[PDB]
Design a protein around this ligand. Structure first.
Ligand SMILES: O=C(Cc1ccccc1)Nc1nnc(CCSCCc2nnc(NC(=O)Cc3ccccc3)s2)s1
Ligand SMILES: O=C(Cc1ccccc1)Nc1nnc(CCSCCc2nnc(NC(=O)Cc3ccccc3)s2)s1
Lengths: 397, 395, 388, 383
C-alpha cells in the first residue's frame, strides 16, 4: 500500500515528492496531511529511502495513494487551473459596473479588486486574483443560515415560517405572500424570519458564537471574521428592514416569545460577518460535498439541509436575474452587495468569485461574466449530459 | 470478445434468452436486430461458433449488458421497488377526472400505469401501460426542443421568455415585454408552435413533427385522436382569446395565420401515446439527444438542456415550485393524467392516471414521484457520496 | 297673461323686434316648443307690425315658455354674457396645437331650458366611438333595471393596471365604461331580435335624446374597426370562457353590433342636446320629451365621473369635477347637472387618449365658473356663477 | 323690519316660534338678542321687542320668512327621526352596540338631534379630512399634493403603501394621513402642533365639543406595528419633508386619532365643509374653498375604505367612517352630519350608519347626480 506508492515515484529527494503532491491540487497545509508533514519535517532534523518513505507517508496513506492514483473528481488539476486563469483574464477586461456606496464601508473598496477561488470536493485548491482580501458576506450569508436552521429544526419546521418559491419581479417588492409568510429564505423578509428560528432560548452573543463556529467548520478552520464597521452603518440605515420587522411582528410571522428588535440586530450582525475568497470557497465545497468539509473530512451539515439550500439558491439566489442565471448557468449560487458570488458545482467543486462593482441587479459584473464563461467551456450545467455534451469539455476525465 | 461471452454461460437458446432479459432488455430491442434475426434462422442448442455467428453484430451492447455496466446493473431489484411504489399510489382513489370534454371524461378513474426506460434501453412496465392517451400538455417540451433544435435558442426566444411568471400573473397572457412568460404555458406553446416549419403548411408541418416524435420514441406507438381534436377545437375559447391578443401585440412571426396555428396547436395536443412510447421519449431527453433503444441523434444537447431547465421550473403548473423543492426532477403534466418525468443520466418515465388534483396534476402520479425521491437519491440536488439513508440504484 | 308680456317688449311691436329679443334669450326659432308661435306669425305676415290682438293670437299657444324666457327665469338668465365667456375659452384652447390625431375645433352648448350657443366647427360630423358608452348603458337601465345590468357589469373604477384586465375578481368586467363592460352591456339591449332591429332601436333612442337633431352612421369607420378588432375579439372570447354573456348570445354578432354603435355620427350641436338630456333628469330640453329614467340618468353620470375620461379620471375629477366621456375621434361628452350639456370636438389626442383642446377647455371652464361637483354656491371666492 | 317681524307678544311665544325654525337659543349669532331678554326679565310691546331683536334682525327675519335652506324643518326632522328608528333595529356587526345617535346641522344653523348624541367618542379615521383641509388651507394644493396622491386605489393596490410615483395614494389612507401630519406646523414642536390643530377643530365646530382621550392614545401606541412599518418605509423612500423626526410624527398621528367629539359638534364640523369654509352657527371663515373643495372630492372616492365605489354609486355623498363607529356625512349646500354606533361590518363601517346613509338618499334626492327638477318619488326638503 505505502510500498507501491514508493515505486510509483534508488531513493527520493523531499522536493520531488512535494512537487508531485502539489500537482494533484492538494496543499501541504491540508489538515488531513498533518501527520505526513510533521514526520516529514522531523526526519529532516535527523532525501529518504524506502522504509523511511513508508514511515512518513503511511499516517494518511489512503489520501495520498488516491491522490497519486488519480482518484479525485478532477484528475488533471493543472489544466483546469490553466482554464480558470484563462477565464479570470477574460472577465478582468470588463471595467463596467458600479461599486455600492450606500454605506461608507462598502464604498471603501477599489473597483479593480478581482478575485476567484476554487476548492474541490476532494480537497484540491486553486486561487487567482485578490483572494486574500476580506469582505463581508452580506447576502451570501442567507443560504448559510438557512442551511443551519434546517439542520437543527428539520425542513418542515423552518417552512412553517418561510416559503419555497421565487416570487417573480413584481410581488417581490411585497414583504409577504397570500398566506402571510415571506416567499423564500433568500429575500430580506425571509432571512429575518429564518434568523429568528435559531437558538431561540439564549441571548444574541451566544447565538452569534453558535453560528460563527458553524461557519468555522464549513470552512475547514479558515478565516471567518467580523466587521463592526459595516455592522454599525448597516444598523443605522436599514429603515426598510425595520419596516419588514414590524410587518412580520404585526402579522405574527415570528415564533412566540421573539423580540423583534433583537432579531434585526442579529440580522445585521450576520451580514457583517467576513470571509476571503479562499475561506468562502471551502464553504461552497462543503455544500458541494453533501455536508462534509473537503479539507477536514468532518461532517457539518445534514444532507436534508444541504439539498434544500442548493434548491433555493437555484431558484431565488441571484436576485431577479435568477431566471436567466438558472437557464444559462444552471448552478446554485448566492449574490452579495460586497461583490461576492458564492457558487456551488455539485459533486465537483466549491467556488467564490469577488468584485465590488455591481450591475443594475446587484451582481458582480466580473463574476457574472465569469460564471457564464465557466459553463460555456465546461459541462457543468444542471441539465448537461455526461455522455453527450457535444463541443464541451469534461474536466472530471 | 464473443468466445468469452460464450464461456460466461453447449447452450440452450432460452437460457441465453433468460440472461438477456435478466439485464432489463427486450428481445424486441432494435439494437439486437441482427442477433434475433440470425438466431431465428438457426432453429434448441448452440456451440462456440454458432453463438459467435449470432452475437458478433451486437457484441458491444451484448458484452455491455452481461458485464454489469449499465446505468442500473441490478435491474430486477429496481423494478421490485418501482412496483412497491406503484402499489402504494394505486391505493389513492382521490381526484377528479377531466370531464370538460367526453374524451377525457370517458376514461376509467382506476386506470393507472407507469413505465421506465433507462439511458441504456433497459425497460420496465406495470399497470395499464399500453392504453393510448393524448399528451395534451406533455407535448409542449417536445415541440420546444424541436423548435430550438431547428432554429436555435436565440431565434426561439425573440418570441418567448425563460422564466416562471410566479403565481398570479400567468393569468396574464404576456409579460411586461409583450412576450409569453415561457413555452410551458398555453400562451407560450402557441407562439412556439408558430415557429416550427414556417415555410410549409399544416399537413406538412404535422408530418414533420410526427417524424421527430417517431425518432424520440424509437418508433414505438405514436398516434392521433380526431375525437379529441374536434372537441378541444370547439371548446377552446380561452385559446382563441390568447391568439387574438398575441396577434394584437404582434407576438407572431411575419406573415402568420394565427387561426391556422391554433388548429396546428389543437392537433399537436391530441397526439396519442402509451406509457411505454412516452417512456422512451423522456429517456431521449435523459440521454442528451439520443434515443436509448435506437442510438440515433434526434435532438441537439442544446435543445435538450433548455427543455429540462423549463420543465424543472415551469412544468407542473402552480405545483411547479413545490415540485422542484421536493421532487427535484423535470416533469410535465397533461390534462389526460400523464406525467413526463426525467431522471438525467439515468432514466425516463411516464406515469398515467386519469384523475387530476386541484392543481391539475395526476394524483397517483405525483404520489409516485414523491415516493421515488424518498427511496432513491434521484433528487436534482442530492449528493452521490453521502446520501444518508436512501438507495443508490446506480449500484 | 299674454297682455303682460306684450309691452314687456308704445302701441305696436315690429315683427322683427320680437324675434331679435327672443334670440337674446338663447332660444332658437327652430325650437319645437315654439312651432305654433312661429307658424302663426308667418301666416300673419301674409296678413310687419304686431298689436295687442294678433300678438296675443300668435304667442297664446307657447306663452308659458315665452314668459320664462322674458321673465329671465331661465337657468342662465344673462345668457349673452355667458356665451361671451364660452368664446373666450374657445379661442384659448385653439392656441394649443399639441396632440396626435389617431386641426378642427368647435364647442356647442345646450342648457336645461333649451338655450343655445356654438362656436367653431360645430356642424361638421364625426364618429362617437367611446362617447356612446354612457348612452347605451342608460338605455339598458331604462329598459332592464340596475339589478339586471349590474348582474353582468360592475360600478367600480379599476386601477392603473388591472385596467389591463378584462374581468374583475368576480368574473365580471370592471365597469360599463371600458371595452369589456360595454360589450356586455351591448349584449343586454334588444335580446330576441337581430342587429337590424337592434341598431334601429338604439338609433331611435339617440334621436329623442338629441331632440331629433342629427344622428347618423359611418360605414368607412365601421369597416376599419371590423379589421382592427383583434383586441375586442380577444376580450369577447375570454368573455365566453367565463360565461359573462346572457344565454343565447352570439358574441361574434355582438361584436359586430358593437363596432356599429361606435360608428354612430353626431355633430357638436346634436351631441350637446344628447348630453343636456342627461343634465335635465331624462327630459330633452328642446322637445320637453321624457327619454330616459332618473335611474338611468343618475347611474350614467356616476360612471362618467369615476370611469369616464379613461385613466385620467382621478386627475379629471379633482380639477374639473364633471361627468364626461372621451372619444378617439376627438370629441368629449361634457355634462353639468341642473345647468347644461356640451360636446367639444378636436381630433388630436394626448398621451392618455384624450383630445388636447377639450381637456384644456374643460379645465378653463371650471377655473372660471363654479360648476365643479363640490364647489360651493354661497362662497366660491373669485369664480363666476352664470346662474346669475 | 323689527316692526315687520312684530306683527309677523309674550316671551314664551317668541322663543317657541323660533325653536320651530330648527334654530336654538344657544346660537352664537343670537346671543345679544338673548342677552336683551335676560335684562327685560327681573310680555313685549313694539318698543321692547324692537329693543331685544334689534341686534340680529337680519338672521331672525331669514328664519321667520322660511328663507333657510330647509323651510319646513320640523317636517324634515320627523323623517330623520323615522329613519333613525328604522336604522336602529339592525343589530348585526362587531365592535372594535346599544348606543346609536345621529345629529344634523344645516348650512343655515338649523339643529336637529336624536339618540346618543351627547356621548363623546374618538374621531379616529374621521380626522383625516379635517387634518388634510387644514394643510391645504395652510400650505396650498400644489405643495400638499407633492407628498401625497389624489387618486383612488383598488382592492389590493391598497395593500401597497405607495404608488409608482413613490407617493402615498391619497389623504384617506393611513400612509397618506401620516404624511399630511408631517406637513402641519413643521417649525414648532409636537405640543404646539397639537394645540394648533385643536384650535382649528374648535372654529369648525363653532366652539362646541372637541377633546382628547389619553386612554385610547396609549392604546394606539402599543398596537401601532403596522403604522410603524409604514412610517419606516416612508422614511426609506425619502417621502417626508426634510428635517422630519418620523417616529414623533407617528406620535402626533396617534394623538389626532384619539381626539374626542360628539355627534353634535361633529355635525357642525361637517357643516363647515357643506358651507364652503364657513361655520353655520358663527358665520366665521375657517377654511379656504380650495381646501374644502379638494376635501369633499377625496371624501367621495376614498372616504369609505373599499366600499367607496358602491357608496359613491348608491349614496353619492362625501363621507368618512372610523373604527369607533362614526361617519362624517356631508350634504353640499344643505347640511353636515355625524352618525355614531360602535358595531362595524367586515368593511369596518358602522352597520347602523351605513343603513342610515342608504335610506336617507333613498328617500331624499340628496344624491350628487339626482336632478332638482325630475327625481321621481324622492323628497326635496328644500321646497
Ligand atoms: O379577474 C381577472 C383575473 C383575476 C384577478 C383576481 C382574482 C381572480 C381572477 N381577469 C382576467 N384574467 N385573465 C385575463 C387575461 C389577461 S389580461 C388581458 C390581456 C393582457 N393584458 N396585459 C397583459 N400583460 C401586460 O401588459 C404586461 C404587464 C402586466 C402587469 C404589470 C406590468 C406589465 S395580459 S383578465
Ligand atoms: O409602488 C410601489 C410598488 C410599485 C408598483 C408599481 C410599479 C413600481 C413599484 N410601492 C410599494 N412597493 N413595496 C411596498 C411594500 C409592499 S406592500 C406593504 C407590505 C405588504 N403588505 N401586503 C403584502 N402581501 C400580501 O398582502 C399578500 C397578498 C398580496 C396580493 C393579494 C392578496 C394577498 S406585503 S409598497
Amino acid at each position: 500500500l505505502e510500498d507501491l506508492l514508493f515505486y510509483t515515484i534508488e531513493k527520493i529527494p523531499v522536493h520531488k515528492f512535494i512537487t508531485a503532491l502539489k500537482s494533484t491540487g492538494l496543499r501541504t497545509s491540508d489538515p488531513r496531511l498533518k501527520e505526513c508533514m510533521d514526520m516529514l519535517r522531523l526526519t529532516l532534523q535527523t532525501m529518504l529511502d524506502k522504509d523511511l518513505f513508508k514511515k512518513c507517508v503511511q499516517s494518511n496513506i489512503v489520501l495520498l495513494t488516491q491522490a497519486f492514483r488519480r482518484k479525485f473528481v478532477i484528475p488533471d488539476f493543472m489544466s483546469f487551473t490553466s482554464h480558470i486563469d484563462e477565464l479570470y483574464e477574460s472577465a478582468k477586461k470588463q471595467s463596467g459596473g458600479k461599486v455600492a456606496d450606500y454605506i461608507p464601508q462598502l464604498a471603501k473598496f477599489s473597483p479593480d479588486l478581482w478575485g476567484v477561488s476554487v476548492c474541490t470536493v476532494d480537497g484540491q485548491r486553486h486561487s487567482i486574483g485578490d483572494t486574500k482580501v476580506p469582505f463581508c458576506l452580506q447576502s451570501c450569508v442567507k443560504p448559510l443560515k438557512y442551511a443551519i436552521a434546517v439542520n437543527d429544526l428539520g425542513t418542515e419546521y423552518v417552512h412553517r415560517y418561510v416559503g419555497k418559491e421565487p416570487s417573480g419581479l413584481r410581488f417581490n417588492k411585497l414583504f409577504l405572500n397570500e398566506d402571510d409568510k415571506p416567499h423564500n429564505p433568500m429575500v430580506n423578509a425571509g432571512a429575518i424570519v429564518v434568523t429568528s428560528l435559531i437558538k431561540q432560548g439564549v441571548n444574541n452573543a451566544e447565538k452569534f458564537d453558535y453560528v460563527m463556529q458553524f461557519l468555522n467548520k464549513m470552512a475547514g478552520n479558515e478565516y471567518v471574521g467580523f466587521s463592526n464597521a459595516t455592522f454599525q452603518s448597516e444598523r443605522e440605515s436599514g429603515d426598510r428592514n425595520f419596516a419588514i420587522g414590524y410587518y412580520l411582528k404585526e402579522k405574527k410571522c415570528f415564533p412566540e416569545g421573539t423580540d423583534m428588535v433583537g432579531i434585526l440586530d442579529f440580522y445585521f450582525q450576520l451580514c457583517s460577518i467576513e470571509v476571503t475568497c479562499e475561506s468562502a470557497s471551502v464553504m461552497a465545497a462543503t455544500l458541494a460535498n453533501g455536508g462534509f468539509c473537503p479539507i477536514t473530512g468532518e461532517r457539518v451539515l445534514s444532507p436534508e439541509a444541504v439539498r434544500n439550500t442548493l434548491s433555493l439558491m437555484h431558484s431565488c439566489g441571484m436576485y431577479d436575474f435568477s431566471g436567466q442565471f438558472a437557464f444559462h448557468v444552471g448552478l446554485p449560487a448566492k449574490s452579495g452587495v460586497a461583490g461576492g458570488i458564492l457558487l456551488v458545482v455539485p459533486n465537483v467543486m466549491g467556488m467564490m468569485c469577488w468584485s465590488p462593482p455591481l450591475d443594475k441587479m446587484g451582481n458582480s459584473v466580473k463574476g457574472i461574466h465569469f460564471c457564464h464563461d465557466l459553463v460555456s467551456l465546461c459541462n457543468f450545467h444542471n441539465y448537461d449530459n455526461l455522455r453527450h455534451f457535444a463541443k464541451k469539455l469534461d474536466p472530471r476525465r
